[PDB]
């Protein structure tokens, strides 16, 4: 089911975003790769 | 042009995250593939 | 180490998503590609 994302973070080291999901026992997440960089 | 995201959902049936956009009639979304799992 | 995403914005021409990060000087971002479309 499409459930809400309640919190989103991005890890500096691994270039993974992690979305915490509003469902069930609270331990579901979704993860995807990203490119992280400093802007000008 | 930059388009604001109002909220995000993720679906464990489809393995897609969906971001809802503040744009036009309100019915646009941006989607991407994600992992979805239950953590420790 | 995870850092908070403060907001997400999607580019309306390229469909790239930018996540703004709460870290350091405020200028760090994470980016990934998306599929944008219009729903019912």
Q: Which two tokens stand for residue B32?
A: 């991407």
Neighbours of C (≥3 Cβ pairs closer than 8 A)? A, B
The b-or-e profile of C8-35 (16+ CB within 10 A means b, else e) is bbbbbeebbbbbbbebeeeebbbebebe
Give the residue from chain C lying closest to B6, CA to CA: C8
Q: Which chain A residues are Cβ-neighbours of C21 within 8 angstroms?
A: 10, 36
The b-or-e profile of A24-39 (16+ CB within 10 A means b, else e) is eeeebbbbbebebeee
Task: Give C4 to chain A, closest Cα distance, Å.
Answer: 4
φ, ψ for residue B23, nearest 5 deg: -170, 145
The boundaries of the domain holding residue A29 are 1-40
- Do B14 and C17 touch, CB atoms closer than 8 A? no
Method used experimentally: X-ray
Domain count, chain B: 1
**Tokens 């997440």 map to which residue?**
A29
β-sheet bridge partners, residue C17: C10, C32
Measuring CA to CA, how many Å separate B13 from each of B22, B33, B40? Answer: 25, 12, 21
């Amino acid at each position: 089911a499409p459930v809400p994302v309640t919190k989103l973070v991005c890890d500096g080291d691994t270039y993974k975003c992690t979305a915490y999901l509003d469902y069930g026992d609270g331990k579901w997440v979704a993860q995807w790769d990203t490119a992280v960089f400093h802007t000008t």
